[PDB]
Structure formats: structure tokens, C-alpha cells
Amino acid sequence: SMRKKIFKPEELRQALMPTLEALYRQDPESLPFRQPVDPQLLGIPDYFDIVKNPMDLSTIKRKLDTGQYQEPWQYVDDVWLMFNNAWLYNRKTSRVYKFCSKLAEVFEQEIDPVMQSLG
Numbered sequence: 001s002m003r004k005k006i007f008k009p010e011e012l013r014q015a016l017m018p019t020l021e022a023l024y025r026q027d028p029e030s031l032p033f034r035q036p037v038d039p040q041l042l043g044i045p046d047y048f049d050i051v052k053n054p055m056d057l058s059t060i061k062r063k064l065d066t067g068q069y070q071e072p073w074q075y076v077d078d079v080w081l082m083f084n085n086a087w088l089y090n091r092k093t094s095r096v097y098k099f100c101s102k103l104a105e106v107f108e109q110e111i112d113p114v115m116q117s118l119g
């Protein structure tokens with residue numbers, strides 16, 4: 001069958017970290033994504049009922065820093081999970097939803113040349 005895990009996790013860390021840094025540079029749009037959603041703090045007790053697999057920038061960063069991503073698409077999947085969770089949970093008219101859309105646009109712009117560099 002197909003080859004798997006051809007890149008070292010540390011090669012993926014080096015190649016992909018600039019795309020994550022681009023998200024962190026978005027001010028104010030990254031602020032709601034820097035830390036895990038806290039439903040008690042935010043007064044949204046249904047959050048974990050709706051969002052079964054939460055994700056945020058700090059979790060992605062720690063996974064990439066520590067070499068937990070073994071394939072480039074696993075990193076992409078977690079970034080998309082973060083955005084899809086926020087689009088699912090929040091009203092389309094909301095500030096967090098709009099900020100999510102901004103981060104997603106930045107991510108798409110940054111990820112395509114990096115994925116090409118892994119080709």
C-alpha cells in the first residue's frame with residue numbers, strides 16, 4: 001500500500017509553524033481562539049453538547065511544538081476543526097463567527113504555498 005509518515009514530525013513543525021504564526025498575528029481576530037473555549041466563563045453551558053471535539057490555537061501549537069503531528073494533513077485537520085466548531089456553535093451574525101471567517105481566509109492563503117513546498 002501507500003507510503004506513510006514520510007516526514008519527520010520536526011520537519012512538519014518547521015514547515016507548518018509559519019502558518020500558525022500567521023493566525024496568531026491577526027489582531028483582534030485571533031483573540032477568541034488563543035485559549036480553549038471555557039463554557040462556564042462564557043456562560044454557554046450547551047457548548048460541549050454541540051462541540052464534541054473542541055480545538056483552539058494553544059492546543060494546535062502545543063501539538064506542533066512537541067511533534068505530535070505525523071502527517072501534514074493532521075495539522076490542517078485540527079485547524080479546520082477549530083474553525084468548523086466556531087462556525088457551528090456561533091450565530092452567523094456574531095463577532096466570533098466573523099473573526100473565525102477572517103482567520104480561515106488567512107489560513108487558506110498561507111497553507112497552499114506551504115503544502116506545495118511539501119510536494
Ligand SMILES: Cn1cc(C(=O)Nc2cccc(C(=O)O)c2)ccc1=O
Pocket residue numbers: 031032033035037042085086089090096
Ligand atoms: C471560539 N469561541 C470563542 C469564544 C470567546 O469569546 N473566547 C474568549 C475567551 C477569552 C477572551 C476572549 C477575547 O476575545 O478577548 C475570547 C466564544 C465562543 C467560541 O466559539
